Structures are given as structure tokens and as C-alpha cells.
Design a protein around this ligand. Structure first.
Ligand SMILES: Cc1cc2nc3c(=O)[nH]c(=O)nc-3n(C[C@H](O)[C@H](O)[C@H](O)COP(=O)(O)OP(=O)(O)OC[C@H]3O[C@@H](n4cnc5c(N)ncnc54)[C@H](O)[C@@H]3O)c2cc1C
Lengths: 314, 326
């Protein structure tokens, strides 16, 4: 958007959602940039169902059940949420405005608050050749709509819970749905795996894919047995990968921020070495910093107010 | 008894309750000392029924329900709860152990975390030493039951956070709820004033009352602007004063702690100037500190871990992930 905002939040993590809540709380046009197509950061991506106990007020809380509590607390102000954008450049222009260039567009902000935790959460890719031409066409890593694969032969890679449920959702939808894993025992919930055999889903296991046959759309996938090392091809139309999520800093170190051991040096005002750029959550660090969500929750409003004193004279 | 505890927490308020939980999170014998006869601190005593919205994770949670969610969260470690004790002396003896003397007995701790308010029980009123009879009847300072002001016309005097929210929570119950302040800007969070204007709650600008029409109960309040001197009478059933300019620290001032603005000055490690003494919540202060519950909850584990690293060297600062302790 060409409209410069007031606070642009790098990271849709738990610190980023609650900080987005506090932005409107001080009359701030709030913009969130997230590398994922989903909010939640580490919780929604790495452990959404697990119970967390050291969050203030929650003797027992699910990770994602708290995320919805943060999104609902946040939708009270409706910030401009720009998903599927990984911030690449963060540069201060001649007038103090920050120029943020992502993979989509360039966003502008009077101040930028970086709640990025450990890095950007782009999914785990493959380990083949330049599949970018498959990725732009029929090679997917996220499931937006499941019905787009109805009547098409679809292959699924992975063994986790995330992979098995996606396959079980394609049994009455996908023409031919096959799930591939490297071991005979799916690293998933046991009673959901039992339903996978009690369905029309072909279960190829233990297999690992090798060759992605397709001129530009993947139409055949060459497998290979873990023990006998025989190659088995199955004709496909779309390919779905669910191995898990990965994070990494990348361009974060090259933004002129004092970074030592993948953490931004911030003061008690949550101010980095760049005026107008603030950080909170686990991505920040200082004397006695404890990498917690409870601490990241207390670093968020401190970061909004000290930025409010940066871009708005009271 | 003569147990040299590990962490003795001054204050059974909301910040101290979460701090007591996180003490057990690092395997610390926890002692809580509270001047009130009840835990909850400011919440259980001054507004136990009101709804809180700026708590991380709770878009809308009741105050006492938040206290009970903390007490339920805390009883996982069963800290030593000493009620009705106001710490008078806090001295570090020759071996580093702190000696705490309350009105009752002498307690011991390896380290001390100060989460208490002031030890007292007083918001802040105006300057009339008469009218003493309205307070026993309809001039209130505290929200006990929300229904006692329901169906009654309630007028509120003040501009702080307490004045704007009480007016906003009396809007769907009280016939006429009015907020009166001595200044042109309600010094509150911006969206609580935004919700204050967008309702039937009558919003009185800077006014100062004159005539409390009543032999013992105020039934009409004749107003007066601080500068323009306009007379506005408002029919009321209850009269509410919500200034709340904090209050003096008291026995905290005599402990050798660097104090700025009735608040203990702490570093980013939540350390006071005394090694082994920590402070968090609204009682602590530093650069850009915001007197919030969101901040005070985030300052609490900062102090527990830095204290676990104070009295126990071979313990990692970064703790064990919470899921791996259940
Ligand atoms: C398995 C596990 C268990 C845990 N258990 C606990 C526990 O019990 N208690 C506890 O207190 N803490 C726990 N934690 C820690 C907790 O998850 C973190 O402290 C918390 O997530 C910090 O919030 P954050 O937003 O800074 O991190 P994150 O959730 O990592 O936020 C990072 C977000 O920013 C985005 N992002 C990053 N870089 C970019 C970029 N360049 N462009 C665009 N978007 C970007 C990412 O996509 C992501 O959404 C646990 C962590 C893990 C991994």
C-alpha cells in the first residue's frame, strides 16, 4: 500500500498479534507482514494443539486456542494484514519513512516493530532441482482450498499429523490420493492413521521420492523403497508437500541492526540501534532477557508506546 | 517458622500471583506476603467484577476470574501465603539472606521480589473535609457490586483509567452514568475513551462540583467548570470519585532502594540497586515503562529467572519450557 502507516509489524507471531492489538489502542494504523499464509508464528506452525502453562492467566491453554484469542483480540481494531510477504529490505528513506520491500510489494511506515522470534517461517521445500517452475504451476506446499484438487490425481509427502489429515480430507475429493513416508509407522496420531487404511487412500510406505517427472507441471513422481531401493512411479496431476516448517533470519542481519547470535540488541525502551525500529518477543535481547511469550507480551506495549513517542508528538 | 525461603514475594496482587507461579517453574520455595486479608491485591478489593481487556490472550475476562485463573494456576506449586502481613523491615543479613519483618513475624528469603502496591488502601480524593455524611450513604470510591449501581443514576468524578472504564461499565446498567474530570483530556487508554463517547454515557468535560444537594444522600449534583463556571445539575443516586494518583511507598522508602515517582527504579534485569531484591508490576519503573498489567506480567518471569541465577549458580537462566514441567 502507498499509504504510509504508523506501525508496521514484522512478524505475525504471538508478540506480533498482541502488539497489533496495542497499536489501535493508541490510535495507530497497523500493518502486519507475515512470511506464512497464516498467523500464529511458532504456535500455529510448530505446536498448535499442545498445552502451554506459563502464560499469565492460563493454567492450561492450547497453543492455537490462544492464537484465536489473540486474533479475536486483534480483530477488535482490524489491522491491514499483508500475508505471504517476507520482508527483504528495510531502509530509512530521506524523510524518516521506512521502505520495506517484500516479495510482493513495498510497504511504508512511520515506525517498524520487528517481532520475528527466530526467523521467517517459509515451509520446508524439497531437495531436488529447480522445482520453481513446478511451484509456480502445480507444486504446492500449502492447502488453501482442498476442492481445487477434486477429480485430480494428488500425491502427498510426509508422515506427520499435518500430512495425514490433509490426505484423509482428499479421500472423498481427490480421484487418486496417495501419501508417502519413509517409515512403516506414521509419525501421526494413531487413531487418525487407523482411519487412513480404512479409506480409499493408497498408502505408500516406506518410500522417499527421487525424480519429479514433469516438463512444467508434475505428472509423474519417481519414488524409491527405503529397504529394497526400487523406483515406483505413480501418475499425478498435483503434488503436495507436508514435512514441517522451517525458520531462518536471512535479510534480518543486513538491516543495520546490532545483532549478536541471532538476537537484536534493544534497550529497556525496546529500541534497537535504528531510530524508529523496535523489536520484541524472542528476536530482541537485553540484560536478563528471558525468551518467553510472557516476556514478549510485556515487551509489546513498551514497544508501541516508545514508538508512539517517536512518530507522534503528544 | 525459621525457614530461609528462596523467594519471598511482597504483595498478593496480580503480578505477585503470576510471579509465585513462575517461582515453582524454577523449583523455588515461594512465600507470598500480603497486607490485605485477601489475595488479588487491587483486583479482588477494588473492582473484582469489572471486565479486563488488555490482558494478553483475553479479549474479555473478568477481574476475579483472572485472579482465580491465577490462583488456580498458582496452586500447582502451593506457595507460602501469609495474609494480613505488611512487611516493615527488609534487611540483607551478613550471609546475603534477607530478613523480612512484618506486623506479625520475621520471614526469611534468599532473594526478595517486590510486586506490592503501596501496602496501604487509598486511591485519592479531592480537598473537602466536610460532607462526611454522603460517603456513608451514596458517595462511593469503590465498585463492590455492579448491580448496586444498576438502575440508579450514577455520577463519576475523575479522568484516570478508573474513571473512564467505570463509566463505560455502568452505561448498560445505570440509568444515567456521568464522568466528570478536572482536566480537558481523559488521561486514559485511547480506545476506552473512544468507547466512552460512542454510548449514552453522559460525558462531562472539565467540571468541579459545588452543591451536593442532600441532608445525607446526594440525589442531585450541581456542577461547575474549572474555567468557564457553567452550572449543570445532574440527577444521581450515587456519586463516584476516581482520581487515583497512586500513593506513597511507605516502608519501601526506608529500604535503601532508588525510588523515582513512588516507583522502585529497576534495570532491564528487573534488579533494584540491592542485589537479591527485585521489583516488577506497577511498582517498578525504568525507561519507557508503562504502568500496565501486560507489562507487569512480562516483567515477572524476568525477575524470577534472574533471581534463580542469583541464589543458585548451576541453574540455567533460560528455564525449562513450560510444557516439559507437566
Ligand atoms: C516447541 C516450542 C515450545 C515452546 N514452549 C514454550 C512454553 O511452554 N512457554 C513459553 O513461554 N514459550 C515457549 N516457547 C517459546 C515461544 O514460542 C516464543 O517465545 C514466542 O513464539 C516468541 O514470539 P515471537 O513472535 O517473537 O516468535 P515467532 O512466533 O517465531 O514469530 C515470528 C513470526 O515472524 C514472521 N517473520 C519472521 N521474519 C520475517 C520476515 N523477514 N518477513 C516476514 N515475516 C517474518 C514469521 O513468519 C513468524 O510468523 C516455545 C517454543 C517452541 C519452539
Amino acid at each position: 500500500n502507498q499509504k504510509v502507516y504508523d506501525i508496521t509489524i514484522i512478524g505475525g507471531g504471538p508478540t506480533g498479534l498482541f502488539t497489533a492489538f496495542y497499536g489501535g489502542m493508541r490510535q495507530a494504523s497497523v500493518k502486519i507482514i507475515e512470511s506464512l499464509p497464516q498467523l500464529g508464528g511458532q504456535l500455529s506452525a510448530l505446536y498448535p494443539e499442545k498445552y502451554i502453562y506459563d502464560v499469565a492467566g492460563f493454567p492450561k491453554v492450547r497453543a492455537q486456542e490462544l492464537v484465536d484469542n489473540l486474533k479475536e483480540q486483534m480483530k477488535k481494531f482490524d489491522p491491514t494484514v499483508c500475508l505471504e510477504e517476507a520482508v527483504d529490505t528495510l531502509e530509512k528513506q530521506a524523510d524518516g519513512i521506512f521502505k520495506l520491500v517484500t516479495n510482493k510489494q513495498t510497504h511504508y511506515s512511520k515506525s517498524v516493530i520487528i517481532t520475528a522470534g527466530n526467523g521467517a517461517f517459509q515451509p520446508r521445500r524439497l531437495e531436488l532441482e529447480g522445482t520453481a517452475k513446478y511451484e509456480k504451476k502445480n507444486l504446492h506446499y500449502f492447502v488453501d482450498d482442498m476442492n481445487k484438487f477434486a477429480g485430480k490425481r494428488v500425491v502427498v509427502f510426509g508422515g506427520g499429523d499435518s500430512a495425514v489429515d490433509w490426505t484423509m480430507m482428499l479421500e472423498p475429493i481427490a480421484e487418486k490420493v496417495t501419501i508417502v513416508h519413509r517409515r512403516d509407522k506414521f509419525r501421526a496420531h494413531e487413531h487418525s492413521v487407523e482411519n487412513l487404511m480404512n479409506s480409499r487412500a493408497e498408502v505408500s510406505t516406506p518410500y522417499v521420492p527421487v525424480e519429479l517427472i514433469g516438463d512444467d507441471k508434475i505428472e509423474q513422481v519417481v519414488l524409491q523403497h527405503v529397504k529394497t531401493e526400487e523406483k515406483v512411479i505413480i501418475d499425478v496431476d498435483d503434488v503436495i508437500v507436508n514435512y514441517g516448517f522451517v525458520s531462518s533470519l536471512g535479510p534480518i542481519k543486513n538491516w543495520g541492526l546490532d545483532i549478536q547470535k541471532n538476537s537484536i540488541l534493544v534497550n529497556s525502551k525496546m529500541e534497537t540501534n535504528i531510530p524508529g525500529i523496535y523489536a520484541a518477543g524472542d528476536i530482541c535481547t537485553y540484560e536478563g532477557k528471558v525468551k518467553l511469550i510472557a516476556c514478549g507480551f510485556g515487551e509489546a506495549p513498551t514497544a508501541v508506546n516508545n514508538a508512539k513517542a517517536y512518530f507522534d508528538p503528544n
